[PDB]
Amino acid sequence: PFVEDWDLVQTLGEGAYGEVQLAVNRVTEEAVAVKIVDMPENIKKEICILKMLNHENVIKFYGHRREGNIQYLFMELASGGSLFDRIEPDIGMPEPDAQRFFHQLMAGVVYLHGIGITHRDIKPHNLLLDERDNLKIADYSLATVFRYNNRERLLNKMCGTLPYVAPELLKRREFHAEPVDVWSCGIVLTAMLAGELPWDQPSDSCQEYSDWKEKKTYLNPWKKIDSAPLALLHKILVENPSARITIPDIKKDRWYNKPLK
Numbered sequence: 001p002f003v004e005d006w007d008l009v010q011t012l013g014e015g016a017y018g019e020v021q022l023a024v025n026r027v028t029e030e031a032v033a034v035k036i037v038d039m040p041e042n043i044k045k046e047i048c049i050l051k052m053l054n055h056e057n058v059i060k061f062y063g064h065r066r067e068g069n070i071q072y073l074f075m076e077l078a079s080g081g082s083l084f085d086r087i088e089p090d091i092g093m094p095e096p097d098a099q100r101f102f103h104q105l106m107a108g109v110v111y112l113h114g115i116g117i118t119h120r121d122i123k124p125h126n127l128l129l130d131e132r133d134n135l136k137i138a139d140y141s142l143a144t145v146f147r148y149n150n151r152e153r154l155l156n157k158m159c160g161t162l163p164y165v166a167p168e169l170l171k172r173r174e175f176h177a178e179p180v181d182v183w184s185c186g187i188v189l190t191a192m193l194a195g196e197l198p199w200d201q202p203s204d205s206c207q208e209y210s211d212w213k214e215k216k217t218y219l220n221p222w223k224k225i226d227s228a229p230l231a232l233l234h235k236i237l238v239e240n241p242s243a244r245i246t247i248p249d250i251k252k253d254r255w256y257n258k259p260l261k
């Protein structure tokens with residue numbers, strides 16, 4: 001299987017709609033990633049957002065080709081695979097590696113927000129790694145514009161992944177985009193530091209979430225996390241989105257700025 005000059009050589013991942021393949025150019029040996037979609041107002045938006053992206057912690061879009069019912073979206077390859085696969089279950093990863101990834105994730109998210117794009121599904125499966133283990137935010141199939149001509153639009157559509165999703169998204173008819181992405185970054189931070197997700201969803205009927213709101217940090221996963229990163233998580237995973245820490249203030253946090261191995 002192939003497309004114009006590229007061979008499709010290995011399945012890198014399966015998706016709801018699609019598949020991502022390792023594409024290797026027959027002549028040049030360049031290797032890229034190609035997302036293959038069967039059957040497009042949506043993918044029209046997606047491609048449009050994809051052509052905006054230019055930042056070292058965001059997956060680069062190379063171009064696309066339509067061949068019948070199939071669209072081929074060519075993108076930078078992340079040959080390190082996903083962050084998901086660097087997280088040891090029940091353990092996490094070393095704190096200095098978690099911090100570095102968190103810095104890189106912030107740099108990507110600030111970039112996105114700066115161009116008025118929200119990603120809306122930040123989680124370790126969507127955070128890929130290049131050959132030097134530089135983090136790249138991938139998959140813009142749920143991404144959308146929240147700021148345009150310097151005017152913010154609130155969101156109303158429910159989407160994302162329940163364990164990463166902010167509580168306002170389940171309780172409010174409309175909500176601001178930025179604090180939803182900040183929240184998912186805090187759940188990613190927890191996963192990195194504890195190798196476990198704290199709750200099934202941030203709802204009033206989920207006991208693990210009530211436990212957090214009651215500050216029972218002698219329970220897992222919090223008891224596995226050092227007090228400095230945990231103090232940051234206390235400012236990110238705040239139920240009311242107007243009281244939640246913003247990225248400019250994350251950048252002032254004591255753990256964020258702590259030198260580590």
Ligand SMILES: CNc1nc(Nc2ccc(C(=O)N3CCOCC3)cc2OC)nc2[nH]cc(Cl)c12
Binds near residue numbers: 033035059075079
């Ligand atoms: C899954 N999506 C993607 N995947 C990749 N790369 C890779 C992802 C996973 C692996 C990986 O460990 N494997 C082991 C298990 O069998 C599959 C490959 C390797 C990758 O590269 C060589 N690069 C992308 N760039 C944009 C998207 Cl979107 C994307």
Ligand SMILES: [Cl-]
Binds near residue numbers: 087191195196197
């Ligand atoms: Cl996890």
Ligand code: NA
Binds near residue numbers: 089
């Ligand atoms: Na698991």
